[PDB]
Design a protein around this ligand. Structure first.
Ligand SMILES: COc1cncc(-c2cc(F)cc(CNC(=O)c3cc(N4CC[C@@](C#N)(C5CC5)C4=O)cc(C)n3)c2)c1
Ligand SMILES: COc1cncc(-c2cc(F)cc(CNC(=O)c3cc(N4CC[C@@](C#N)(C5CC5)C4=O)cc(C)n3)c2)c1
Ligand code: PRO
Ligand code: PRO
Ligand SMILES: [Cl-]
Lengths: 469, 478
């Protein structure tokens, strides 16, 4: 049972929740975490969704080696050798792209791979959020024109919005990264950002880069034109990781533990026979089995927790901590009345449902839960953003654990200065630096001559700032 | 580009040409590692979806464990050691997984307390690293490869062994039902067994052109051995602690290599319809604007019709290539069926269909296309399998004495021979066969087949002269 309370002791709540739900297991190498089925199934679900969608775009999967020509591999079982793990595979894939692309009809080229990457940062580790090894997908495409590459950047970003909002019920904000926060060596980075109210931090949910021609020039990825001229390809890359699971956990969880959106939950309905220690005669479990078969006919994912020793209250708490969206209780009166009691995890509301009506009503409830989780989260996102005009509004907003939307001149040195000055102010108040999250695609109007909230120069666009992961 | 090496003359060069010119493989600066290009990955995804669906029906759940393993857990030459980060040594070196028993089973020891926690059935899809010094072979013997490894724990041995056999049957289906590759079920010798395990079962395949057997997949009864070393125990119903009974089982991208080698021909790849991401490629014949728009439109209608019968169709309407180039391209890639549509076909209300495996052409009315192509695809799948099965049967000589061994090996055949099953004799046979051969010429056991021929009373071991125990399949091998 989760005993830390989410808003009072958030990091402790997160650690308790992810372990007591059986999502992760600890490991004797720092920064590495076992993904148990309760978490991994969620990965399987968003992976299937995204993979189906990119295949509709003509992206095809592949596998490139994990060794880059540095985590050095010096020996093979104490036989020394005469290596380097991928943090990301641009340098692994792009020589191959230079080889594969010769003329305009070789384009576009669109590849994806699902794999794990290793990033051995010294800083402190947190499961799903920032780890030594994590799973992701990385897509890399090359196009004859910049317009086509940018169109794909935006299509992928929309797919990421759907990954978060339709699968995980997490609202995100589409936007463009500042010059200082864009991918190294690219033209323009787009992103979807999420918000964590309990610590007021923005977090990058996924990222989709217009690399432009810089990588082509560096790796000599050229193609011959239709008129016979050598031209550089225009490239993109885009990635999204198991950090999505962390965001989902933080968005929907409450004081009792996780809440898993029905669309991705490994079990959608747990059937809990109200049986005590020697009560097994087959009457309750039989109807439990019948109900499982019926519900599975409607493509509902069901488990019966028929484990001998635990009380019904133990099982209720166990499955609430895991965050299964619906619980179906079947005990003796239920059996004698022909009904079952269903409790939905997000609100605790209970329904007495006739056995005939179970599969429809549950489908209904699941849609309700999934929509409600999104709408409540979207409302919290909206209540977490203060639209300001001047710098004196910044520190107050940050102390309410909010982000700010402010008019900005988009000068990069100004972003560095704002980082340093908000860090300074935070230490004197006693990680406190505030930085840009994105420049949202949805731009409110910019009245003529609006001043940048920090520099006083002419503002160019509304920019989203906050403390960050 | 097209294949020009002949499969029955320079087999190695033929294989290299077939995997490169079909766009399956790309070479890499780090020896023993290859890029797996999309055309190969499509086949991998087909067999992966099949096997994953089937183990999900058994209650196995997917998971993901770390790629790194500590020195103590690993050792409770193949193994790659991360020893430095930059110029600095790590305080303690850590290893990249060659296999995950030592990574998963400490967690198993912690998760299993009661008979109510069993069975525990997990799988993961990942890659592993076995860094041998010798010459690699794309797909078949590589330093990094993709696989699935399944790991289960049970309250009884009988239950674990049932699961071992059920997984082995899934591997038979993977090879024979999906890839159309015949395999032989059997049990490994004591010396070829998984180290630490109790009993290893296997499906073995055969490569006729070089005479070599190769393990296609493997399913181990670990028994209680690993439960002992990792202290994986459960309380039964009367409060007594018992060790669990364990299995582990794996299958890799080697299967793609075996498929290639089995069905490929002088024109290159031949993909069995069941694992072809493109079963039918439609090639519109456009020459000097003879009815361009109408031909393209009819191609799209035919694709929709075929898709409704679940046929996997691609229209190659790419402009910058000729029809003849498209023929060669999709041939070397092994697409099972090519459909051609031109002005003549447009008028007659028909299409011309060429099957990759034999080259036989058919003229088919549009209304008949779907049932006829479903039939042809079933026929191609079954024919690939049956021809390979005959080649496998012709590549095994049943013998009784050692003096028949070297002739049979020189015919590039395997031998099925009665054997006493003492391990010393397997080492002795290996050494003598190698010496007589004069890339290894040695002969080792491939498996003791489940399907045992009769053992007449008093049959002698082909090598020691002691009483034979069972028929054992031997050969040169990968
Ligand atoms: C940022 O300052 C830090 C502060 N405090 C601690 C750390 C830290 C500590 C460690 F011990 C180990 C690590 C290494 N892991 C990662 O860097 C990382 C990055 C991402 N990322 C980065 C952005 C991205 C998106 N969208 C990219 C597309 C991929 C996405 O998901 C996801 C995960 C799970 N892990 C970081 C780092
Ligand atoms: C035997 O002396 C040799 C002679 N000549 C060359 C080598 C060699 C050279 C290398 F450069 C790299 C390697 C390492 N790769 C592998 O050993 C290997 C094993 C398997 N295996 C082993 C059995 C199994 C089955 N079924 C198990 C389920 C897993 C299955 O698929 C699959 C693959 C793709 N690679 C070996 C070794
Ligand atoms: O690390 C990144 O952000 C880019 C996009 C995915 C692969 N590399
Ligand atoms: O390497 C092997 O043979 C076993 C089976 C898969 C996991 N370990
Ligand atoms: Cl946290």
């Amino acid at each position: 049972m989760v005993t830390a309370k989410k808003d009072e002791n958030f990091s402790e709540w997160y650690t308790q929740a992810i372990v007591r739900s059986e999502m992760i297991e600890y490991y004797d190498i720092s920064g590495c975490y076992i993904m148990r089925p309760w978490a991994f199934h969620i990965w399987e679900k968003v992976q299937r969704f995204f993979d189906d969608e990119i295949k509709k775009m003509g992206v095809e999967n592949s596998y490139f080696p994990m060794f880059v020509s540095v985590a050095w591999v010096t020996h093979y079982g104490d036989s020394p050798l005469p290596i380097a793990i991928r943090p990301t595979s641009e340098t692994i894939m792009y020589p191959a792209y230079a080889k594969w692309i010769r003329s305009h009809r070789d384009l576009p080229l669109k590849l994806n791979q699902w794999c794990s990457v290793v990033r051995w940062e010294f800083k402190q580790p947190t499961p799903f959020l920032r780890t030594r090894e994590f799973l992701w997908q990385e897509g890399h495409t090359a196009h004859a024109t910049e317009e086509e590459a940018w169109e794909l950047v935006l299509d992928i970003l929309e797919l990421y919005r759907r990954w978060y909002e339709e699968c995980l019920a997490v609202p995100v904000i589409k936007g463009e990264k500042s010059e200082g926060e864009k991918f190294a060596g690219g033209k323009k980075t787009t992103t979807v950002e999420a918000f964590i109210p309990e610590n007021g931090r923005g977090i990058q949910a996924a990222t989709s880069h217009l690399l432009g021609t810089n990588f082509a020039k560096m790796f000599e990825i050229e193609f011959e034109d239709e008129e016979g001229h050598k031209r550089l390809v225009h490239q993109t890359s885009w990635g999204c990781t198991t950090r999505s699971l962390g965001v989902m956990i933080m968005t929907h969880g409450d004081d009792k533990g996780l809440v898993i959106p029905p669309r991705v939950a490994s079990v959608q309905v747990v059937i809990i026979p109200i049986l005590f220690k020697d009560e097994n005669t087959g009457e309750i479990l039989g109807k439990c089995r019948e109900l499982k078969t019926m519900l599975e006919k409607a493509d509902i994912r069901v488990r019966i927790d028929d484990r001998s020793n635990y009380t019904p209250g133990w099982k209720y708490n166990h499955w609430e901590v895991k965050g299964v969206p619906l619980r179906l209780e079947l005990g003796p009166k239920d059996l004698a009345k022909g009904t079952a009691r269903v409790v939905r995890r997000d609100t605790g509301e209970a329904y007495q449902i006739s056995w005939a009506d179970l599969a429809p009503k549950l489908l209904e409830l699941m849609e309700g839960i999934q929509r409600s989780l999104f709408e409540k989260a979207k409302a919290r996102l909206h209540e977490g953003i203060e639209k300001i005009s001047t710098f004196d509004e910044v520190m107050p907003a940050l102390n309410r654990k909010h982000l700010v939307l402010a008019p900005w001149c988009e000068d990069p040195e100004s972003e560095e200065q704002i980082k340093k000055e908000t860090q300074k102010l935070s230490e004197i108040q006693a990680t406190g630096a505030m930085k840009t999250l994105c420049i949202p695609f949805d731009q409110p109007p910019m009245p003529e001559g609006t001043k940048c909230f920090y520099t006083g120069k002419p503002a160019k666009r509304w920019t989203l700032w906050g403390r960050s992961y």
